[PDB]
Scaffold this active site. Structure first.
Site, PDB file in Angstrom:
ATOM      1  N   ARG A   1     -28.732  -8.110 -39.103  1.00  0.00           N
ATOM      2  CA  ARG A   1     -29.469  -8.946 -38.117  1.00  0.00           C
ATOM      3  C   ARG A   1     -30.215  -8.058 -37.101  1.00  0.00           C
ATOM      4  NH1 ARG A   1     -24.466 -10.681 -38.728  1.00  0.00           N
ATOM      5  NH2 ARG A   1     -23.938  -9.591 -36.809  1.00  0.00           N
TER       6      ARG A   1
ATOM      7  N   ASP B   1     -18.606  -7.100 -40.373  1.00  0.00           N
ATOM      8  CA  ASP B   1     -19.558  -8.200 -40.166  1.00  0.00           C
ATOM      9  C   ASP B   1     -19.184  -9.587 -40.715  1.00  0.00           C
ATOM     10  OD1 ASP B   1     -23.136  -8.794 -40.306  1.00  0.00           O
ATOM     11  OD2 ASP B   1     -21.854  -8.630 -38.525  1.00  0.00           O
ATOM     12  N   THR B   2     -18.789  -9.712 -41.991  1.00  0.00           N
ATOM     13  CA  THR B   2     -18.774 -11.079 -42.517  1.00  0.00           C
ATOM     14  C   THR B   2     -17.626 -11.903 -41.997  1.00  0.00           C
ATOM     15  OG1 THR B   2     -17.921 -10.174 -44.528  1.00  0.00           O
ATOM     16  CG2 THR B   2     -20.217 -11.020 -44.569  1.00  0.00           C
TER      17      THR B   2
ATOM     18  N   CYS C   1     -17.469 -10.688 -54.471  1.00  0.00           N
ATOM     19  CA  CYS C   1     -16.816  -9.974 -53.373  1.00  0.00           C
ATOM     20  C   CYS C   1     -15.424  -9.436 -53.703  1.00  0.00           C
ATOM     21  CB  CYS C   1     -16.710 -10.886 -52.140  1.00  0.00           C
ATOM     22  SG  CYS C   1     -15.872 -10.197 -50.748  1.00  0.00           S
ATOM     23  N   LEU C   2     -15.226  -8.137 -53.486  1.00  0.00           N
ATOM     24  CA  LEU C   2     -13.915  -7.504 -53.687  1.00  0.00           C
ATOM     25  C   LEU C   2     -12.973  -7.785 -52.533  1.00  0.00           C
ATOM     26  CD1 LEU C   2     -15.099  -4.068 -55.111  1.00  0.00           C
ATOM     27  CD2 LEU C   2     -13.833  -5.859 -56.387  1.00  0.00           C
ATOM     28  N   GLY C   3     -13.551  -8.094 -51.372  1.00  0.00           N
ATOM     29  CA  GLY C   3     -12.805  -8.303 -50.147  1.00  0.00           C
ATOM     30  C   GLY C   3     -12.290  -9.733 -49.988  1.00  0.00           C
TER      31      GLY C   3
HETATM   32  C1  HEM Z   1     -15.870 -14.493 -45.342  1.00  0.00           C
HETATM   33  C2  HEM Z   1     -15.959 -13.176 -45.585  1.00  0.00           C
HETATM   34  C3  HEM Z   1     -16.814 -12.531 -46.703  1.00  0.00           C
HETATM   35  C4  HEM Z   1     -17.910 -13.000 -47.349  1.00  0.00           C
HETATM   36  C5  HEM Z   1     -18.617 -14.361 -47.139  1.00  0.00           C
HETATM   37  C6  HEM Z   1     -18.341 -12.013 -48.292  1.00  0.00           C
HETATM   38  C7  HEM Z   1     -19.407 -12.074 -49.141  1.00  0.00           C
HETATM   39  C8  HEM Z   1     -19.783 -11.169 -50.125  1.00  0.00           C
HETATM   40  C9  HEM Z   1     -20.883 -11.345 -51.043  1.00  0.00           C
HETATM   41  C10 HEM Z   1     -21.801 -12.594 -51.075  1.00  0.00           C
HETATM   42  C11 HEM Z   1     -20.953 -10.225 -51.812  1.00  0.00           C
HETATM   43  C12 HEM Z   1     -21.903  -9.902 -52.986  1.00  0.00           C
HETATM   44  C13 HEM Z   1     -23.249  -9.285 -52.603  1.00  0.00           C
HETATM   45  C14 HEM Z   1     -24.213  -9.136 -53.781  1.00  0.00           C
HETATM   46  O1  HEM Z   1     -24.006  -9.715 -54.900  1.00  0.00           O
HETATM   47  O2  HEM Z   1     -25.253  -8.411 -53.590  1.00  0.00           O
HETATM   48  C15 HEM Z   1     -19.891  -9.326 -51.405  1.00  0.00           C
HETATM   49  C16 HEM Z   1     -19.615  -8.061 -51.958  1.00  0.00           C
HETATM   50  C17 HEM Z   1     -18.650  -7.209 -51.509  1.00  0.00           C
HETATM   51  N1  HEM Z   1     -17.742  -7.431 -50.482  1.00  0.00           N
HETATM   52 FE1  HEM Z   1     -17.575  -9.217 -49.350  1.00  0.00          FE
HETATM   53  N2  HEM Z   1     -17.499 -10.932 -48.156  1.00  0.00           N
HETATM   54  C18 HEM Z   1     -16.533 -11.203 -47.222  1.00  0.00           C
HETATM   55  C19 HEM Z   1     -15.511 -10.342 -46.848  1.00  0.00           C
HETATM   56  C20 HEM Z   1     -15.296  -9.049 -47.286  1.00  0.00           C
HETATM   57  C21 HEM Z   1     -14.339  -8.100 -46.757  1.00  0.00           C
HETATM   58  C22 HEM Z   1     -13.371  -8.411 -45.603  1.00  0.00           C
HETATM   59  C23 HEM Z   1     -14.446  -6.951 -47.444  1.00  0.00           C
HETATM   60  C24 HEM Z   1     -13.673  -5.627 -47.254  1.00  0.00           C
HETATM   61  C25 HEM Z   1     -12.341  -5.597 -47.314  1.00  0.00           C
HETATM   62  C26 HEM Z   1     -15.483  -7.144 -48.426  1.00  0.00           C
HETATM   63  C27 HEM Z   1     -15.906  -6.212 -49.341  1.00  0.00           C
HETATM   64  C28 HEM Z   1     -16.900  -6.341 -50.272  1.00  0.00           C
HETATM   65  C29 HEM Z   1     -17.256  -5.302 -51.217  1.00  0.00           C
HETATM   66  C30 HEM Z   1     -16.590  -3.915 -51.392  1.00  0.00           C
HETATM   67  C31 HEM Z   1     -18.387  -5.886 -52.039  1.00  0.00           C
HETATM   68  C32 HEM Z   1     -19.164  -5.227 -53.159  1.00  0.00           C
HETATM   69  C33 HEM Z   1     -18.722  -5.606 -54.552  1.00  0.00           C
HETATM   70  C34 HEM Z   1     -19.746  -5.077 -55.531  1.00  0.00           C
HETATM   71  O3  HEM Z   1     -20.953  -4.854 -55.169  1.00  0.00           O
HETATM   72  O4  HEM Z   1     -19.377  -4.922 -56.718  1.00  0.00           O
HETATM   73  N3  HEM Z   1     -15.996  -8.428 -48.298  1.00  0.00           N
HETATM   74  N4  HEM Z   1     -19.217  -9.914 -50.357  1.00  0.00           N
HETATM   75  C1  LIG Z   2     -24.660  -8.827 -48.537  1.00  0.00           C
HETATM   76  C2  LIG Z   2     -23.248  -8.275 -48.268  1.00  0.00           C
HETATM   77  C3  LIG Z   2     -22.410  -9.449 -47.736  1.00  0.00           C
HETATM   78  C4  LIG Z   2     -22.553  -7.558 -49.433  1.00  0.00           C
HETATM   79  C5  LIG Z   2     -21.314  -6.924 -48.815  1.00  0.00           C
HETATM   80  C6  LIG Z   2     -21.799  -6.548 -47.385  1.00  0.00           C
HETATM   81  C7  LIG Z   2     -23.255  -7.015 -47.400  1.00  0.00           C
HETATM   82  C8  LIG Z   2     -23.856  -7.054 -45.997  1.00  0.00           C
HETATM   83  C9  LIG Z   2     -23.931  -6.055 -48.325  1.00  0.00           C
HETATM   84  O1  LIG Z   2     -24.670  -5.137 -47.997  1.00  0.00           O
HETATM   85  C10 LIG Z   2     -23.484  -6.383 -49.741  1.00  0.00           C
HETATM   86  C1  LIG Z   3     -18.698  -8.535 -48.016  1.00  0.00           C
HETATM   87  N1  LIG Z   3     -19.020  -8.508 -46.927  1.00  0.00           N
END
Ligand code: HEM
Ligand SMILES: CC1(C)[C@@H]2CC[C@@]1(C)C(=O)C2
Ligand SMILES: [C-]#N
Ligand SMILES: [K+]
Length: 405
Positions: A177, A242-243, A348-350
């Site tokens: 943002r 952030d998310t 998402c891995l998280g």
């Molecule tokens: C409500 C909370 C969250 C939302 C809505 C969210 C959403 C997402 C989304 C939409 C993506 C895919 C992006 C793409 O396809 O380009 C993603 C990827 C990822 N997220 Fe999250 N996320 C959340 C929380 C977290 C947290 C807490 C972590 C860390 C512990 C995390 C770690 C990751 C990682 C490592 C990826 C990359 C996976 C890959 O590219 O193979 N996320 N997330």
């Molecule tokens: C779009 C995302 C939610 C996903 C994990 C963090 C994020 C900001 C990225 O850059 C990939």
């Molecule tokens: C995933 N943030």
């Protein structure tokens, strides 16, 4: 301004939506994006905003596009183009086959088994934050809980000092943002500037923390490089800061405004997990995208090689084709359809960590502070971007209605 319309794009498909400042933002960010799903708007439109790009507006096309990594590449996943070009985080900037080996490593630090390692700390931190606030009868939710809760958990997991949070949080916000003070590339370089000596230190002297684990890790049986380690760890900081922070505020804003829904969860706490899923649908907040690897006709529309396409994760669950009455929150919704955590190989891995943090927050907050509302006269402002959010969230309650546990 508006970028000149490229020759291959028909004038009937133009809809000048600005993902960083959507025109209907005062009505709420999800509502502002939902203008893309009004009866007059095609499934796939072109905006001249932010350099010019496609937007898929319906869950069917969003899902299809996320599945087809051959045509829709993650190499350039952010708008504007200069951000997507600079973007080199691992695994997110990679497509299969190469992406997969890095997923397994990342999963080792943020996946289900680490949620179990952190279980009690998560629980303890939520309870202690909330108990500290409880007697006050008011808080600034975004700064007093939404930020410190997931971020302090993340900094613990990553073995980074809590005094580094203001700097790292500033940098992360510029990537999702931006306020205009830094380009994506400047913020990325500053994040890497921070990480370089830390990664060095922890390869020489490994600890138990997430950075040490990644930096000394293997990918499909071979040592990870310093560069590769830096590019994930970068991704992990962004994801940690952030998310979940923003999602918590959307959820709590809704609960403050909806006594009936709070009541439901107080009387039927077993519904909290299902409620978490429904709020994840309704207050979905991510929108990134892909770049076309070749000319491709997709749903009757001619996409050209190198065109960016925004594939808003937020929109799938708001699509009335996926969920009846999609703007209504119904914790008893029978089939909650969404792509809030993404779709396809980058799911998402998280997410397991995220759900744990959300579920813990709802249970432990409603236990101590069952009855609260938005501060009288406050107007809640949202901000839109790659990850949308809540500017501030003043809450109030009567301490007499609260319970110390
Ligand atoms: C409500 C909370 C969250 C939302 C809505 C969210 C959403 C997402 C989304 C939409 C993506 C895919 C992006 C793409 O396809 O380009 C993603 C990827 C990822 N997220 Fe999250 N996320 C959340 C929380 C977290 C947290 C807490 C972590 C860390 C512990 C995390 C770690 C990751 C990682 C490592 C990826 C990359 C996976 C890959 O590219 O193979 N996320 N997330
Ligand atoms: C779009 C995302 C939610 C996903 C994990 C963090 C994020 C900001 C990225 O850059 C990939
Ligand atoms: C995933 N943030
Ligand atoms: K790139």
């Amino acid at each position: 301004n508006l970028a000149p319309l490229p020759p291959h794009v028909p004038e009937h498909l133009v809809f000048d939506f600005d993902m960083y400042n959507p025109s209907n933002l005062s009505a709420g960010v999800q509502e502002a994006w939902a203008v893309l799903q009004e009866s007059n708007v095609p499934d796939l439109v072109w905006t001249r905003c932010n350099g010019g790009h496609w937007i898929a507006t319906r869950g069917q096309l969003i899902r299809e596009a996320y599945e087809d990594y051959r045509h829709f590449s993650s190499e350039c996943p952010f708008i504007p183009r200069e951000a997507g070009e600079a973007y080199d985080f691992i695994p997110t900037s990679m497509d299969p086959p190469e992406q997969r080996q890095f997923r397994a490593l990342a999963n080792q630090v943020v996946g289900m088994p680490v949620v179990d390692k952190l279980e009690n700390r998560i629980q303890e931190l939520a309870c202690s934050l909330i108990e500290s606030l409880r007697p006050q009868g008011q808080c600034n939710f975004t700064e007093d809980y939404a930020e410190p809760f997931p971020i302090r958990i993340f900094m613990l997991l990553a073995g980074l000092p809590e005094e580094d949070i203001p700097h790292l949080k500033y940098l992360t916000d510029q990537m999702t943002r931006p306020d205009g003070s830094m380009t994506f590339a400047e913020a990325k370089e500053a994040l890497y500037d921070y990480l370089i000596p830390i990664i060095e230190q922890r390869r020489q002297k490994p600890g138990t923390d997430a950075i040490s684990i990644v930096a000394n890790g293997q990918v499909n049986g071979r040592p990870i490089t310093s560069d590769e380690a830096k590019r994930m760890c970068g991704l992990l900081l962004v994801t940690g800061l952030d998310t979940v922070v923003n999602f918590l505020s959307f959820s709590m804003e809704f609960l403050a405004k909806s006594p009936e829904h709070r009541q439901e969860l107080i009387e039927r706490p077993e519904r909290i997990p299902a409620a978490c899923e429904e709020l994840l649908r309704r207050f979905s907040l991510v929108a990134d995208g892909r770049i076309l690897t070749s000319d491709y006709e997709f749903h009757g529309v001619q996409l050209k090689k190198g065109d960016q396409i925004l594939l808003p994760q937020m929109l799938s669950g708001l699509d009335e084709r996926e969920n009846a009455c999609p703007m209504h929150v119904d914790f008893s919704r029978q089939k909650v359809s969404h792509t809030t955590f993404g779709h396809g190989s980058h799911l998402c891995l998280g997410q397991h960590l995220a759900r744990r943090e959300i579920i813990v927050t709802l249970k432990e907050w409603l236990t101590r502070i069952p009855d609260f509302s938005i501060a009288p006269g406050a107007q809640i402002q949202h901000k839109s971007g790659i990850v949308s959010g809540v500017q501030a969230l003043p809450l109030v309650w009567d301490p007499a209605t609260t319970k110390a546990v």
